[PDB]
Design an enzyme around this catalytic site. Structure first.
Site, short mmCIF file in Angstrom:
data_model
loop_
_atom_site.label_atom_id
_atom_site.label_comp_id
_atom_site.label_asym_id
_atom_site.label_seq_id
_atom_site.Cartn_x
_atom_site.Cartn_y
_atom_site.Cartn_z
N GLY A 91 0.81 -1.20 0.00
CA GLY A 91 0.00 0.00 0.00
C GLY A 91 0.85 1.26 0.00
O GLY A 91 2.08 1.22 0.04
N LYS A 114 4.26 12.28 -3.12
CA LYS A 114 5.15 11.22 -2.68
C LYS A 114 6.12 11.76 -1.64
O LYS A 114 6.79 12.77 -1.87
CB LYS A 114 5.90 10.62 -3.87
CG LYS A 114 6.79 9.44 -3.52
CD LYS A 114 7.18 8.66 -4.77
CE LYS A 114 8.05 7.47 -4.43
NZ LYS A 114 8.46 6.73 -5.65
N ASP A 126 9.44 5.62 7.71
CA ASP A 126 9.23 6.97 8.21
C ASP A 126 8.28 7.78 7.34
O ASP A 126 7.99 8.94 7.68
CB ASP A 126 10.57 7.70 8.34
CG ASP A 126 11.34 7.74 7.03
OD1 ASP A 126 10.77 7.39 5.98
OD2 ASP A 126 12.53 8.12 7.06
N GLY A 127 7.79 7.21 6.24
CA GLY A 127 6.85 7.90 5.38
C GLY A 127 7.43 9.05 4.59
O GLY A 127 6.68 9.92 4.14
N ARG A 184 -2.24 -0.41 -9.74
CA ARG A 184 -1.16 -1.27 -10.19
C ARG A 184 -1.65 -2.70 -10.29
O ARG A 184 -2.72 -3.05 -9.78
CB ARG A 184 0.04 -1.20 -9.24
CG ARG A 184 0.46 0.22 -8.86
CD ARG A 184 0.23 0.46 -7.37
NE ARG A 184 0.52 1.84 -6.96
CZ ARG A 184 1.72 2.27 -6.58
NH1 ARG A 184 2.76 1.45 -6.56
NH2 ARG A 184 1.88 3.54 -6.23
N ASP A 253 3.64 -4.64 -7.81
CA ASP A 253 3.07 -3.42 -7.26
C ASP A 253 3.62 -2.16 -7.93
O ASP A 253 3.11 -1.07 -7.67
CB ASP A 253 3.33 -3.34 -5.75
CG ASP A 253 4.78 -3.56 -5.40
OD1 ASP A 253 5.31 -4.65 -5.71
OD2 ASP A 253 5.40 -2.63 -4.82
N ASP A 263 7.15 4.38 -10.53
CA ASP A 263 8.07 4.27 -9.40
C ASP A 263 9.52 4.28 -9.86
O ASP A 263 10.07 3.24 -10.23
CB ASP A 263 7.82 3.01 -8.57
CG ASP A 263 8.63 3.00 -7.27
OD1 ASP A 263 9.55 3.84 -7.12
OD2 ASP A 263 8.35 2.16 -6.38
N1 LIG Z 1 10.23 5.43 3.78
C1 LIG Z 1 9.14 4.66 3.66
N2 LIG Z 1 8.17 4.79 4.59
C2 LIG Z 1 7.07 4.03 4.49
N3 LIG Z 1 6.76 3.13 3.55
C3 LIG Z 1 7.74 3.03 2.64
C4 LIG Z 1 8.92 3.74 2.62
N4 LIG Z 1 9.69 3.37 1.52
C5 LIG Z 1 8.96 2.46 0.92
N5 LIG Z 1 7.77 2.20 1.55
C6 LIG Z 1 6.74 1.26 1.13
O1 LIG Z 1 7.34 0.01 0.87
C7 LIG Z 1 6.79 -0.57 -0.33
C8 LIG Z 1 7.88 -0.71 -1.37
O2 LIG Z 1 8.29 0.62 -1.79
P1 LIG Z 1 8.47 1.02 -3.31
O3 LIG Z 1 8.13 -0.16 -4.24
O4 LIG Z 1 9.84 1.56 -3.46
O5 LIG Z 1 7.37 2.14 -3.64
P2 LIG Z 1 7.55 3.65 -3.25
O6 LIG Z 1 8.68 4.24 -4.03
O7 LIG Z 1 7.87 3.79 -1.74
N6 LIG Z 1 6.12 4.47 -3.56
P3 LIG Z 1 5.53 4.26 -5.14
O8 LIG Z 1 6.41 4.98 -6.11
O9 LIG Z 1 4.07 4.86 -5.22
O10 LIG Z 1 5.45 2.74 -5.54
C9 LIG Z 1 5.62 0.32 -0.73
O11 LIG Z 1 4.40 -0.13 -0.17
C10 LIG Z 1 6.03 1.68 -0.16
O12 LIG Z 1 4.91 2.51 0.12
CA LIG Z 2 10.37 3.12 -5.08
MG LIG Z 3 6.68 1.02 -5.46
#
Ligand SMILES: Nc1ncnc2c1ncn2[C@@H]1O[C@H](COP(=O)(O)OP(=O)(O)NP(=O)(O)O)[C@@H](O)[C@H]1O
Ligand SMILES: [Ca+2]
Ligand SMILES: [Mg+2]
Ligand SMILES: [Ca+2]
Ligand SMILES: [Ca+2]
Ligand SMILES: [Ca+2]
Ligand SMILES: [Cl-]
Length: 476
Positions: A91, A114, A126-127, A184, A253, A263
């Site tokens: 998610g 983002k 850490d979001g 996705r 995803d 992404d």
């Molecule tokens: N710093 C973070 N804090 C919280 N969740 C994270 C963080 N980095 C990654 N995630 C989550 O870990 C999963 C894998 O991350 P990723 O595939 O790199 O997507 P993302 O770059 O974080 N966001 P997106 O570009 O919309 O896919 C996803 O569900 C992300 O939302």
């Molecule tokens: Ca990513």
């Molecule tokens: Mg991603």
């Protein structure tokens, strides 16, 4: 006409699907926001001019401080196969769908912020996103679009002095990602594998009506939609391979339901050609190497197909997946023919392209500059200059002869027309890792001139620009 920030019209379709598909979550602001860079083209998707991006209110909104009352920020839920292994719950862990803007053309555009903060899906994260992450994602989004490669778009990067720890101390930033959908493959997998058949159908019907509506009239609408998704993916991957884009994280995803690049993390544009380059230092098995992007894309489409088995027979789904490879090869060969200045399809063209790549493989040849220089002079003169870059120089002479013979086997126009045709599809400037790095260094010191100029150059990557010779150089 270009409008004010207070005149944006919102129509939050996905929010109205309810709490089974996403969760209402507000952004957590970051301190001392500054505009790093903005894309005029991306902003135009929202009927906004570049001047509106320079407003303090603009930086405040897309750093999490303020938000239109008409917005409804939401964090989507989804799952996905990560490096081949299913993860039942992912998610939006660090981004939010602020809302969907309805532009004057009648189009809906997602506003995804983002790096917006923690959500129910963040797990231990850490979001946040750091400045280098936001800048690279912004640059690649808009560079790919300017190249003609379907991609999510990026409107801006906003910096801050909110501390964020990664390997060392870094600082949070946000990027405003624009796309017509953030669904996705993994969005559908989640509802399939959690066995929520009503909601799975509601999501598939959302994708169908909003993005593949022509398929609704056919006997099996979801089969027709799946075929269209397979087609879009074949075209997408063909452009990646033809132009040397390495994604690095082709988890399901990260596969857009629209067939756009999605992404940007450890991506890289090839400098020296290397059919097995691994752009992701965490991809220890080379699952997402350059050449593997073709079989992986098919694998991801099979995973998507699984989520549609409640609606479509396995045989029909697998027959549709069988279209991916021939369609990819068709579009790939078309693109490479054009990069070679060719204008008709002939039988042995696949061998011609394949032989060129094997010659490049271990000779340290810049992929982009090879094709640009190939068109900058008549073939005979260009090839005599490119000769020296190849180790097997005499094997290259044989390929050069085959290429000149291939040109002569068709009407190819004048030398000048050939040059213009080839320079129209062969970029002079690409988003090389070392160039992005230099922009990031300056921006981390508070100087945004470099990132802005680099972005500017890549808006017209096929056109020579005065004084920008440094951006056309091989990595030092
Ligand atoms: N710093 C973070 N804090 C919280 N969740 C994270 C963080 N980095 C990654 N995630 C989550 O870990 C999963 C894998 O991350 P990723 O595939 O790199 O997507 P993302 O770059 O974080 N966001 P997106 O570009 O919309 O896919 C996803 O569900 C992300 O939302
Ligand atoms: Ca990513
Ligand atoms: Mg991603
Ligand atoms: Ca070789
Ligand atoms: Ca060389
Ligand atoms: Ca002729
Ligand atoms: Cl990050």
């Amino acid at each position: 006409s270009m409008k004010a920030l207070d005149e944006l019209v919102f129509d939050n379709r996905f929010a109205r699907l309810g709490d089974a598909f996403s969760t209402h979550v507000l952004p957590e602001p970051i301190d001392a926001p500054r505009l790093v860079v903005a894309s005029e083209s991306a902003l135009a998707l929202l009927d906004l001019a570049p001047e509106q991006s320079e407003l303090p209110l603009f930086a405040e909104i897309f750093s999490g401080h303020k938000l239109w009352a008409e917005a409804e920020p939401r964090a989507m839920v989804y799952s996905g196969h990560q490096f081949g292994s299913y993860n039942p719950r992912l998610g939006d862990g660090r981004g939010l769908l602020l809302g969907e803007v309805y532009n004057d053309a009648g189009e809906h555009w997602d506003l995804h912020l983002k790096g917006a903060g923690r959500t129910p899906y963040s797990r231990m994260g850490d979001g946040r996103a750091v400045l280098r992450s936001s800048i690279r994602e912004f640059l690649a989004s808009e560079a790919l679009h300017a190249l003609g490669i379907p991609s999510s778009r990026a409107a801006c990067v906003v910096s801050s002095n909110t501390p964020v720890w990664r390997e060392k101390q870094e600082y949070a930033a946000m990027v405003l990602r624009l796309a017509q959908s953030h669904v996705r493959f993994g969005s559908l997998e989640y509802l399939f594998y959690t066995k929520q058949p009503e909601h799975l159908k509601t999501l598939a019907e959302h994708v169908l009506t909003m993005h593949y509506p022509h398929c609704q009239e056919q006997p099996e609408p979801y089969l027709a939609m799946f075929r269209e998704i397979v087609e879009r993916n074949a075209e997408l991957i063909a452009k990646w391979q033809a132009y040397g884009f390495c994604h690095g994280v082709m988890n399901t995803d990260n596969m857009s339901i629209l067939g756009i690049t999605f992404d940007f993390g450890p991506f890289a544009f090839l400098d020296d050609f290397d059919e097995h380059f691994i752009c992701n230092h965490s991809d220890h098995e080379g699952r997402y190497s350059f050449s593997n992007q073709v079989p992986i894309a098919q694998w991801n489409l099979s995973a998507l197909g699984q989520a549609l088995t409640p609606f479509v027979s396995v045989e029909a789904l697998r027959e549709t997946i069988g279209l991916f490879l021939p369609l990819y090869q068709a579009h790939y060969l078309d693109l490479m023919r054009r990069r070679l200045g060719l204008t008709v399809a002939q039988d042995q063209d696949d061998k011609l392209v394949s032989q060129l790549l094997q010659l490049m493989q271990n000779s340290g040849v810049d992929y982009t500059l090879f094709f640009r220089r190939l068109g900058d002079q008549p073939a005979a003169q260009a090839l005599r200059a490119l000769r020296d870059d190849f180790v097997d120089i005499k094997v290259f002479d044989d390929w050069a002869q085959a290429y000149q013979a291939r040109i002569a086997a068709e009407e190819n126009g004048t030398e000048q027309a050939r040059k213009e045709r080839m320079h129209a599809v062969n970029p002079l400037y690409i988003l090389r890792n070392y160039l992005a790095q230099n922009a990031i260094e300056a921006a981390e010191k508070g100087d945004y001139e470099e990132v802005r100029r680099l972005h500017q150059v890549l808006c017209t990557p096929f056109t020579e620009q005065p004084g920008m010779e440094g951006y056309a150089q091989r990595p030092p």
